[PDB]
Every structure is written in C-alpha cells, then in structure tokens.
Amino acid sequence: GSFVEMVDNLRGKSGQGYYVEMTVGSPPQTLNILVDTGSSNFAVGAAPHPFLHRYYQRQLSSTYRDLRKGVYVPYTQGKWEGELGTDLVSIPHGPNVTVRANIAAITESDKFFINGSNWEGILGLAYAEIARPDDSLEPFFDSLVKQTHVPNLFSLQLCGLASVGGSMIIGGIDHSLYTGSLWYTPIRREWYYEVIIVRVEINGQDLKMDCKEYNYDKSIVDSGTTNLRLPKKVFEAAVKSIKAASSTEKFPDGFWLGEQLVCWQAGTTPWNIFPVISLYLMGEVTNQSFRITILPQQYLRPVEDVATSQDDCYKFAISQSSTGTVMGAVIMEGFYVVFDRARKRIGFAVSACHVHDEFRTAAVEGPFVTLDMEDCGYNIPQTDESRSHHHHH
Ligand SMILES: CC1(C)Cc2cc(Cl)ccc2C(N[C@@H](Cc2c(-c3cn[nH]c3)csc2Br)C(=O)O)=N1
Ligand SMILES: [Zn+2]
Ligand SMILES: [Zn+2]
Numbered sequence: 001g002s003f004v005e006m007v008d009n010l011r012g013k014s015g016q017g018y019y020v021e022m023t024v025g026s027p028p029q030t031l032n033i034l035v036d037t038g039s040s041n042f043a044v045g046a047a048p049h050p051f052l053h054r055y056y057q058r059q060l061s062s063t064y065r066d067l068r069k070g071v072y073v074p075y076t077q078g079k080w081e082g083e084l085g086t087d088l089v090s091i092p093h094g095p096n097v098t099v100r101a102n103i104a105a106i107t108e109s110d111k112f113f114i115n116g117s118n119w120e121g122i123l124g125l126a127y128a129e130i131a132r133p134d135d136s137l138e139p140f141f142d143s144l145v146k147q148t149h150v151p152n153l154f155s156l157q158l159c160g161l162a163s164v165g166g167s168m169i170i171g172g173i174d175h176s177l178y179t180g181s182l183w184y185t186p187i188r189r190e191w192y193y194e195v196i197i198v199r200v201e202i203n204g205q206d207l208k209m210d211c212k213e214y215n216y217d218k219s220i221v222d223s224g225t226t227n228l229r230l231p232k233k234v235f236e237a238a239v240k241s242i243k244a245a246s247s248t249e250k251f252p253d254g255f256w257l258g259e260q261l262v263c264w265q266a267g268t269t270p271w272n273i274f275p276v277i278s279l280y281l282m283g284e285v286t287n288q289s290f291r292i293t294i295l296p297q298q299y300l301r302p303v304e305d306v307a308t309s310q311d312d313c314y315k316f317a318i319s320q321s322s323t324g325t326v327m328g329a330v331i332m333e334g335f336y337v338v339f340d341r342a343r344k345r346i347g348f349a350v351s352a353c354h355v356h357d358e359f360r361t362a363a364v365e366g367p368f369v370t371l372d373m374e375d376c377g378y379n380i381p382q383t384d385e386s387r388s389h390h391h392h393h
C-alpha cells in the first residue's frame with residue numbers, strides 16, 4: 001500500500017461525492033464507500049435497496065460481531081438507521097494493514113443512497129465528538145491509528161452525470177499530487193474539521209464583514225458536501241458581488257438559487273466575467289493568514305441534459321447555510337488537502353488536477369499579516385443538553 005498504491009484510489013459521479021474501495025468481513029466483501037470528512041460513523045447499507053445492487057451481508061462474515069445496539073441518524077432532509085457491530089476492515093488500495101472497526105449496518109434509510117452513483121456506505125473521517133449515537137463509538141480512523149503504525153494523518157486530492165477521480169493518501173503526503181507551497185491552518189476544535197476564516201474577497205474586493213460572520217456558527221472542511229455553503233449574510237454579500245461582476249449576463253433568480261442552469265453555445269462560456277473567490281484562513285502564526293483562491297470553474301458546475309447538448313450548461317454551486325460555512329467539493333477540488341490530525345492542522349496546496357483557464361489559476365498564497373487580528377471564531381451558545389452530559393474520557 002504505497003503512496004503510488006494509493007494514487008487514484010477514488011472515484012465518483014459529479015455532485016454525488018467520492019468513494020474508496022474497502023473490504024469488510026472474512027471472507028472479504030468489497031464495497032464502494034463515500035469518503036466523508038463531515039461525519040464520524042463508518043456505515044454500510046446492509047439490506048436490499050432499489051438503488052443498491054450490493055450491500056454488506058453480516059451473515060456472510062465469520063468475523064462479524066453484533067454490539068446489540070441500534071443507531072438512528074437524522075439529517076435535515078433524510079436519515080439512516082441501523083445496527084452497530086464490529087468487523088475486520090481493509091482498504092485494498094491503501095495501507096497494508098487490517099483492523100477491527102465499528103460498523104453500523106444500515107437497515108433503513110431515506111434520501112440517503114440515490115440513483116446512479118455507486119457507493120454502498122459512508123466513511124466518516126471526522127472526530128469522535130460528533131459520532132452517533134455518542135462519542136464513545138470510536139471512528140474508523142481512530143481504530144486505524146490505534147491498532148497499526150499508520151501515521152495519524154490522511155490527505156485528499158479530489159479532481160472535479162460526469163465521472164470524477166482522485167486520491168486519499170492514508171498516513172502520508174504524496175508530493176506528486178500538488179505544486180508549490182503547502183499552507184497550514186489550525187484545527188480549532190476536534191469535532192468537525194473546524195477552521196477559522198479571517199477574510200473573504202471577490203475579485204480582490206474585501207467583503208468587509210465582521211470576520212465572525214464568516215464563521216457563523218462554524219467553518220468546516222467537508223468532502224461529504226458538494227457546494228461551498230455560506231452563512232446567510234455572507235452568502236448575500238457574495239451573490240451581490242458576483243452578480244455585479246457578471247452583469248453583462250442577466251440570469252434568472254433560479255440560477256443564483258442553484259435551482260436552474262444557465263447555458264452558452266459550446267466553447268463560448270465567458271469565464272472572465274465571473275470573479276475569483278479567495279478565503280483567508282488563520283495561519284499557524286498568530287497574526288498570519290494565507291488565502292485559498294478558487295476559479296468560477298470550481299463554483300460553476302457543468303451539467304449535461306439533452307436536445308440542446310450542443311450548449312455548455314452550468315449550475316451555481318454556492319449556496320445559503322444556516323449551519324455555518326461548509327468548504328465542500330467546490331473548494332476541495334482546487335486543492336490537495338492534508339488532514340494532519342497529529343499536528344491538529346489542515347494543509348492546502350494547489351492540486352496537480354487543476355480545472356483551469358488559459359489566463360487564471362486556483363492558488364494557495366501567503367503570508368498576509370495583520371496587526372490587530374481580532375478573534376474570528378464564534379462561540380456556539382451552550383445548551384443545557386450539551387452542558388449536562390458527562391465525558392469520562
Ligand atoms: C455525506 C452525505 C451523503 C450525507 C447526506 C445524508 C442525506 Cl440523508 C442526504 C444528503 C447527504 C449528503 N449531501 C450532499 C450531496 C451528496 C449526496 C446525496 C445527496 N442526496 N443524498 C445523498 C451523496 S454524496 C454527496 Br457529496 C450535500 O448536501 O451537499 N451528503
Ligand atoms: Zn481494487
Ligand atoms: Zn459522570
């Protein structure tokens with residue numbers, strides 16, 4: 001399981017995520033598993049479903065053990081539930097180790113698996129604090145690093161219905177996947193991969209918001225999310241600014257809402273009217289930041305429907321959040337992202353698989369120094385529910 005063994009180990013469908021092959025059980029059942037840095041459960045479909053053709057069959061695994069505890073995982077717009085267990089787990093195009101991990105066998109779901117794409121399960125790569133049913137359920141990556149000698153890091157190259165590829169480097173960094181400098185931003189708190197944005201610019205123009213507005217009520221790095229999602233106030237300022245820049249073209253409201261495509265005759269899309277977006281992340285040094293800059297080729301996603309397949313058509317992939325900024329696939333496809341859990345930090349460097357203009361490029365640039373660096377994190381109002389629960393850990 002070399003870094004060369006790990007290169008190009010991801011596949012997916014456009015806007016339906018990236019998945020990696022894993023083997024569960026003995027004898028080995030192979031499944032395609034979504035890589036999800038925004039949750040913390042390893043869960044696999046384990047019963048028939050109209051949109052699956054394989055699933056994890058507990059009864060075929062000699063190594064499976066039932067934990068005799070169910071789990072229920074609600075989302076804003078769907079759910080999964082299942083039965084907790086443990087089994088031997090391997091990643092065939094990854095490190096040459098095998099581990100006993102927690103696995104939730106998914107027995108019912110709603111709007112979770114969908115038509116087309118080809119994963120049967122999710123690998124929650126974030127921290128125990130957001131695991132279901134509670135943070136005593138050790139996540140896969142925790143188990144990987146506690147049971148083997150794999151270094152406590154992994155990296156993601158996501159290259160951007162169309163088929164997509166990429167790489168997850170487990171336990172290292174592969175220098176072939178990126179060009180130029182690697183910049184690190186602190187992980188603010190180990191739950192999500194929470195980071196702190198200090199400044200936002202649209203074509204070099206500062207949004208000039210209180211920087212806490214950028215991180216309201218959190219900012220996270222999430223391979224499980226398609227869009228760049230932005231807090232409501234922030235999202236409105238960004239759309240006003242992008243609208244201003246692209247004003248030679250007057251799009252319907254549906255477009256800005258992500259509910260409608262806009263099209264140009266093949267080859268003729270005016271990329272130059274759409275601005276770049278730079279998010280400045282807290283540096284490792286106090287008073288420092290660096291910026292990650294994305295092109296409209298990342299936030300305007302190609303979509304191919306029929307009859308007028310002669311046109312290139314696009315959806316706007318920046319959307320409104322009430323749960324904070326989410327740096328989803330729109331951001332991550334620009335970059336090689338290092339999840340350096342050992343050193344409690346996330347790195348960004350420019351990806352070798354750039355989707356880029358003849359005249360412009362996605363960039364990772366710093367330092368930028370500030371005197372009077374205000375504190376830009378937001379403190380989430382502490383609920384009694386959260387205050388009461390004891391953590392003897
Ligand atoms: C990580 C995951 C699968 C979690 C999830 C659960 C549910 Cl119930 C619905 C959507 C999603 C979901 N939403 C995505 C899109 C998506 C989806 C999806 C969309 N609908 N259902 C799954 C699969 S992989 C990706 Br990336 C997003 O909201 O941006 N992501
Ligand atoms: Zn394989
Ligand atoms: Zn107690």
Ligand SMILES: [Zn+2]
Pocket residue numbers: 135136390391392393
């Ligand atoms: Zn706890």
